[PDB]
Design an enzyme around this catalytic site. Structure first.
Site, PDB file in Angstrom:
ATOM      1  N   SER A 176       0.586  -1.458  -0.181  1.00 46.64           N
ATOM      2  CA  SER A 176       0.151  -0.448  -0.041  1.00 46.64           C
ATOM      3  C   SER A 176       0.985   1.009   0.127  1.00 46.64           C
ATOM      4  O   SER A 176       1.862   1.025   0.881  1.00 46.64           O
ATOM      5  CB  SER A 176      -0.852  -0.115   1.377  1.00 46.64           C
ATOM      6  N   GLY A 177       0.699   2.070  -1.088  1.00 47.00           N
ATOM      7  CA  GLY A 177       1.073   3.315  -0.461  1.00 47.00           C
ATOM      8  C   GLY A 177       2.346   3.166  -1.760  1.00 47.00           C
ATOM      9  O   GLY A 177       3.355   4.270  -1.618  1.00 47.00           O
ATOM     10  N   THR A 223      -0.743   2.438  -8.126  1.00 48.12           N
ATOM     11  CA  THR A 223      -2.656   2.809  -8.336  1.00 48.12           C
ATOM     12  C   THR A 223      -2.178   3.902  -9.496  1.00 48.12           C
ATOM     13  O   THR A 223      -2.485   3.977 -10.756  1.00 48.12           O
ATOM     14  CB  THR A 223      -3.333   3.336  -7.684  1.00 48.12           C
ATOM     15  N   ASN A 226      -1.579   4.991   3.012  1.00 53.70           N
ATOM     16  CA  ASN A 226      -1.517   6.848   2.052  1.00 53.70           C
ATOM     17  C   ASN A 226      -3.095   7.113   2.159  1.00 53.70           C
ATOM     18  O   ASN A 226      -3.523   6.099   2.292  1.00 53.70           O
ATOM     19  CB  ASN A 226      -1.515   4.929   0.680  1.00 53.70           C
ATOM     20  N   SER A 248      -6.009   5.392  -0.494  1.00 60.08           N
ATOM     21  CA  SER A 248      -5.832   3.764  -0.308  1.00 60.08           C
ATOM     22  C   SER A 248      -6.723   2.863  -1.539  1.00 60.08           C
ATOM     23  O   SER A 248      -7.760   3.352  -0.965  1.00 60.08           O
ATOM     24  CB  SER A 248      -5.021   3.098   0.769  1.00 60.08           C
ATOM     25  N   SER A 249      -6.463   2.307  -2.426  1.00 58.02           N
ATOM     26  CA  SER A 249      -7.181   1.324  -2.634  1.00 58.02           C
ATOM     27  C   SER A 249      -7.870  -0.233  -2.142  1.00 58.02           C
ATOM     28  O   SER A 249      -6.814  -0.268  -1.691  1.00 58.02           O
ATOM     29  CB  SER A 249      -6.748   0.417  -4.086  1.00 58.02           C
ATOM     30  N   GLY A 292       0.309  -6.367  -2.829  1.00 61.77           N
ATOM     31  CA  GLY A 292       0.942  -7.891  -2.972  1.00 61.77           C
ATOM     32  C   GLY A 292       1.064  -8.296  -2.075  1.00 61.77           C
ATOM     33  O   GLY A 292      -0.080  -8.345  -1.653  1.00 61.77           O
ATOM     34  N   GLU A 346       0.473  -9.525   1.645  1.00 59.72           N
ATOM     35  CA  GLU A 346       0.145  -8.585   2.912  1.00 59.72           C
ATOM     36  C   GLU A 346       0.322  -9.107   4.305  1.00 59.72           C
ATOM     37  O   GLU A 346       0.518 -10.424   4.763  1.00 59.72           O
ATOM     38  CB  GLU A 346      -1.596  -8.309   3.029  1.00 59.72           C
TER      39      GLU A 346
HETATM   40 MG   LIG Z   1      -3.859   1.718  -5.220  1.00 58.23          MG
END
Ligand SMILES: [Mg+2]
Length: 741
Positions: free
Chosen positions: A180-181, A185, A227, A230-231, A451, A453
């Site tokens: 994340s971060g 994206t 993030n 974040s998605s 990827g 976690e």
């Molecule tokens: Mg994302």
């Protein structure tokens, strides 16, 4: 040609700055270095020590402070010669050890060179600042250039994919993963941007394709501690082209939406962006019609203590989201209803349940309830009843139950989560309807998903994502294998995923998910029944499984990326994702036009039913099926640190990702054979002067090469004559470099 203009931004921003001279002599030096851990008080911290001596079996080097340490040759991490500092492909390195790998990345990062190849991968490190390399002018330099032709860049890989599509008439895929971060994206948007431009119809479609993800971001992204944007869902973007190579349509598949964030967020975090958008952005008039107030006025938004993101205007974003909806094609009516749903949810969160009267729950004040009912267009009496007195099938009997406050509350929460997840699903479907073509010739699909976690606490969703990642890594492994074999063939020259995979998705013997599903059938099963069944089948019996020494609620899985410890709490619930039938009924009669779909369209309202796990498993197999039909491209995004800061590349943070994402392993593998492979002429161009014979630009390049080689008296086993390149084993080329002209 910016590519040839050393004064261009292309040069400034994407290349290692080139001086006047190119000559070999330049980089000459007696000094030979080594990478050492100044302290196994660290093991990714290293310093460069100069070798000051050696014995037949070990080296001796100085340290920074000046202390002489000793190393075993077969244990030394030799540093590559300085000419290698900054190469565009790690495959170009002679010494391919961990510190050496990190060092190349770092040298590049220190010059704002965030992209570097590593064999088949494109490695991208988040710079945490905006580098101006994604302008239209940057887009244009990448058109049709081969990989070897231009600097590393996401545009480059995207170009290579588009050309491949056209040339091999084969579908393609870009897999963009990492933490994340990391910038997944960010990079996925650059891939779309690029294609829309090298293949768009100089257009409505395209605009709609681009305006599609801002709609999804509003509803699927949130500020987390990692993030600000974040998605909270994974996605696969299919970009559709006709046989001529023009974009013809598009499709999106979403995965693992974090419905849970709707009803709870940790300290400093935010709920999904839209809540904030609506609240800030709505017209004084729309508020009144939605019973809107400040975020502070809403339990679903007033708990984390963060209602705003620095440098972000919720109001301005609202405008952007609405615009996007306008462009894609959402009717104003549809838009009202979407906002109504968001509003209602907020109202549902504000419902307060009380006890006392007995053990059962009641609604003394019904403002909230009424608020939600109006916006949704359902019966508040029906709603109230469905909330605290659902009818439950006690065998033959269909009797209503009086739920306590807790139970009551949780049910409420489950209604909110289903409304949110269904809306999301409907928005995705709405958008596909617009963009998507049944008549597609080719496609380039983009997967932007996390990827592996490995958090403090690992739950069901982490097992899922990690399950996916075992599949994707095994897919890359297979792929590296073929491509590697192919190269070797073209030039005339010479695991374990299964077991983890089976433990998770196996049917006979049953693996984790199978057992979970089985327990899922029994109303009275608990976390304890579950974990006990798991241990029963795998503790000391399955090599990739581990029963904790003391925890009673966790179990570990040996993943590709290392062991992961999971907690079983709520797995049963998560697997069924229940919602009271009466709640379904209430909402099925909704007078709202969007709400009715969420509850009456089996494709939105239901899974199949099959379990959450079974659906995850099926959706993962479909994705992989697809991928298997493409020619894939791998992008590994890396976060430089945990602070969201520029110019701060932390060795430990970085190395850990390199270890987990497959980069260092592939290097390990590569490094074993003939990692370095060079074009004959390329070789002479550089080393001619090393042999008493050789002309820089000789026509018989291979000979020329053999020449140098011979001059040097290099050991034959260390190199291989290929049809177009000279294949070198690890360290050989560095020594070569190390040769006197
Ligand atoms: Mg994302």
């Amino acid at each position: 040609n910016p590519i040839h203009d050393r004064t261009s931004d292309y040069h400034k921003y994407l290349k290692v700055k080139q001086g006047d001279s190119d000559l070999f002599k330049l980089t000459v030096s007696d000094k030979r270095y080594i990478w050492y851990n100044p302290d196994p008080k660290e093991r990714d911290s290293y310093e460069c020590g100069e070798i000051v001596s050696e014995t037949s079996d070990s080296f001796t080097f100085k340290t920074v402070d000046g202390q002489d340490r000793q190393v075993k040759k077969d244990d030394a991490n030799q540093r590559n010669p300085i000419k290698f500092d900054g190469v565009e492909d790690m495959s170009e390195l002679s010494y391919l050890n961990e510190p050496a790998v990190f060092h190349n990345l770092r040298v590049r990062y220190n010059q704002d060179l965030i992209y570097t190849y590593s064999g088949l991968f494109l490695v991208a490190v988040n710079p945490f600042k905006r580098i101006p390399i994604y302008t239209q002018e940057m887009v244009d330099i990448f058109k049709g250039r081969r990989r070897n032709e231009v600097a590393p860049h996401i545009f480059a890989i995207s170009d290579v994919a588009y050309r491949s599509m056209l040339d091999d008439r084969q579908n393609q895929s870009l897999l963009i993963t990492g933490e994340s971060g990391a910038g997944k994206t960010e990079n996925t948007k650059k891939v779309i941007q690029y294609l829309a431009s090298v293949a768009g119809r100089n257009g409505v479609l395209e605009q709609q394709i681009l305006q599609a993800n801002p709609i999804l971001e509003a509803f699927g992204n949130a500020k987390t501690t990692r993030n600000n944007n974040s998605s909270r869902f994974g996605k696969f973007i299919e970009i559709q082209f006709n046989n001529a190579g023009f974009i013809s349509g598009a499709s999106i598949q979403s995965y693992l939406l974090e419905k849970s964030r709707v009803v709870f967020q940790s300290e400093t975090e935010r709920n999904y962006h839209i809540f904030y958008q609506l609240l800030a952005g709505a017209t004084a008039e729309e508020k009144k019609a939605l019973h809107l107030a400040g975020p502070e006025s809403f339990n679903y938004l007033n708990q984390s203590g963060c209602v705003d993101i620095k440098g972000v205007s919720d109001s301005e974003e609202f405008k952007i989201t609405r615009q996007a909806m306008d462009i894609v094609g959402f009717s104003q009516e549809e838009q009202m209803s979407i906002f109504k749903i968001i509003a209602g949810i907020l109202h549902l969160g504000n419902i307060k349940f009380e006890k006392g009267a007995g053990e059962g729950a009641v609604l003394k004040d019904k403002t909230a309830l009424n608020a939600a009912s109006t916006v949704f267009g359902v019966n508040p009496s029906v709603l109230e009843k469905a909330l605290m007195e659902p009818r439950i099938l006690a065998g033959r009997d269909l009797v209503a139950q009086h739920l306590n406050v807790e139970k009551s509350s949780s049910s409420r929460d489950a209604l909110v989560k289903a409304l949110y997840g269904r809306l999301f699903l409907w928005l995705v479907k709405k958008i596909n309807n617009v963009l998507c073509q049944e008549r597609k010739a080719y496609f380039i699909g983009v997967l932007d998903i996390s990827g592996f976690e490995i958090f403090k606490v690992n739950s069901f969703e982490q097992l899922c994502i990690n399950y996916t990642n075992e599949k994707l890594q095994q897919f890359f492994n297979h792929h590296m294998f073929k491509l590697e074999q192919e190269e070797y063939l073209k030039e005339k020259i010479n695991l374990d995923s299964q077991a983890t995979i089976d433990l998770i998705d196996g049917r006979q013997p049953p693996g984790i998910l199978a057992l979970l599903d089985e327990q899922s059938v029994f109303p009275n099963a608990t976390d304890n029944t579950l974990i006990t069944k798991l241990h029963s089948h795998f503790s000391k019996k399955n090599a990739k499984y581990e029963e904790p020494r003391f925890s009673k609620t966790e179990f570990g899985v040996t993943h590709y990326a290392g062991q992961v410890m999971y907690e079983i709490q709520d797995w049963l619930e998560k697997n069924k994702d229940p919602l009271q039938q009466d709640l379904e009924l209430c909402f099925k009669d909704s007078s709202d036009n969007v709400v009715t779909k969420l509850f009456n369209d089996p494709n939105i309202a239901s899974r199949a039913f099959i379990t959450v796990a079974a659906q995850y498993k099926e959706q993962l197999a479909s994705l992989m099926a697809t991928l298997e039909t493409t020619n894939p491209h791998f992008v590994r995004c890396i976060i430089p640190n945990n602070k969201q800061l520029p110019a701060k590349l932390e060795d430990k943070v970085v190395l850990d990702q390199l270890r987990c994402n497959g980069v260092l392993e592939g290097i390990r593998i590569t490094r074993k054979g003939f990692p370095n492979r060079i074009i004959y002429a390329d070789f002479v161009k550089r080393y001619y002067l090393l042999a008493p014979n050789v002309p820089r630009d000789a026509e018989d390049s291979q000979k020329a090469t053999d020449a140098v080689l011979k001059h040097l008296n290099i050991d034959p086993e260390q190199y291989r004559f290929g049809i177009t390149k000279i294949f070198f084993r690890a360290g050989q080329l560095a020594r070569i470099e190390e040769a006197r002209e």
